[PDB]
C-alpha cells in the first residue's frame, strides 16, 4: 500500500544499493535535491553577492 512501512522499507532498501553502472550511480546521486523557483534563485544570488562583498572587504 501507501503506508504500513512496506513502501518506505522498499524505498530505503533500493536506495542503499550498489548501482555498479557509473552513469546510473551519478543519476541517482543528482536525483536528490528538489527544483527551485525564481524567488529562490534571486535570494540565493543575493546571498552569493553578500558573501563575495564580505570576502573582498576581508581582503
Amino acid at each position: 500500500e501507501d503506508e504500513s512501512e512496506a513502501l518506505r522499507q522498499a524505498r530505503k532498501d533500493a536506495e542503499l544499493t550498489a548501482s555498479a553502472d557509473s552513469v546510473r550511480a551519478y543519476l541517482k546521486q543528482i536525483g536528490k535535491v528538489a527544483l527551485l523557483n525564481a524567488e529562490e534563485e534571486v535570494e540565493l544570488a543575493k546571498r552569493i553577492e553578500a558573501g563575495l562583498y564580505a570576502t573582498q572587504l576581508m581582503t
Binding site: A18, S19, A20, S22, A25
Partner: protein, 49 residues
C-alpha cells in the same frame, strides 16, 4: 588524486580485501564512492566524553 590498482582489487582472490579483512563488495563500494568508511577513531576522547 590517488587511484587504486585494478589487479589487487578485482580478481579471483581480492588481495586488498584479504589484506584489510574487507569483503570485495564493500571494497568496491569504498573505492567507487558509494559508501563512506571510517579511517580512524579516537579512544581517549570518546572514553572521557
Amino acid at each position: 588524486a590517488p587511484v587504486t590498482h585494478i589487479w589487487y582489487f578485482k580478481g579471483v582472490p581480492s588481495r586488498l580485501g584479504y589484506l584489510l579483512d574487507l569483503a570485495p563488495k564493500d571494497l568496491e563500494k569504498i573505492i567507487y564512492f558509494a559508501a563512506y568508511v571510517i579511517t580512524s577513531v579516537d579512544e581517549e576522547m570518546r572514553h572521557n566524553e
